[PDB]
């Protein structure tokens, strides 16, 4: 017999933020971005 | 954990103009692994 177990977790997080303000007239523009990529893998084998 | 963030400000007077900008980014990664293996054998021979 052999009994085999594997566990695996992967996480990624990314953020971007930008804001601009001009005065002359007056103007503003802004943006926000957020991100995640995530993976889980579990794999097993058993022989008898 | 990784972060890069910048802030910029400018005002100019001669007319008056000003610009201010703030920019920030965060990056994080986490990975977790686990594994288990066990093996065994028996032979028995009897006469």
């Amino acid at each position: 017999f052999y009994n085999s177990t594997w566990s695996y977790v992967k996480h990624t997080s990314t953020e971007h933020t930008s804001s601009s303000r001009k005065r002359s007239f007056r103007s503003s523009s802004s943006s926000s971005r957020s991100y995640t990529s995530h993976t889980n893998e579990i794999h097993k084998g058993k022989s008898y | 954990e990784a972060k890069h963030c910048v802030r910029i400000e400018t005002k100019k007077r001669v007319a008056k103009k000003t610009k201010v900008e703030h920019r920030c980014t965060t990056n994080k990664l986490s990975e977790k692994h686990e594994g288990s293996f066990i093996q065994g054998a028996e032979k028995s021979i009897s006469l």
Partner: peptide, 29 residues
């Protein structure tokens, strides 16, 4: 380690047809 992440290869053909040959199998590390 989870050594079977690096799977074992298939065995060699036996070194001789009779009288105790040997065969081996490395991993794909």
């Amino acid at each position: 380690c989870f050594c079977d992440h690096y799977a074992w290869t298939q065995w060699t053909s036996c070194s001789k047809t009779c009288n105790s040959g040997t065969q081996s199998r490395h991993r794909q590390i």
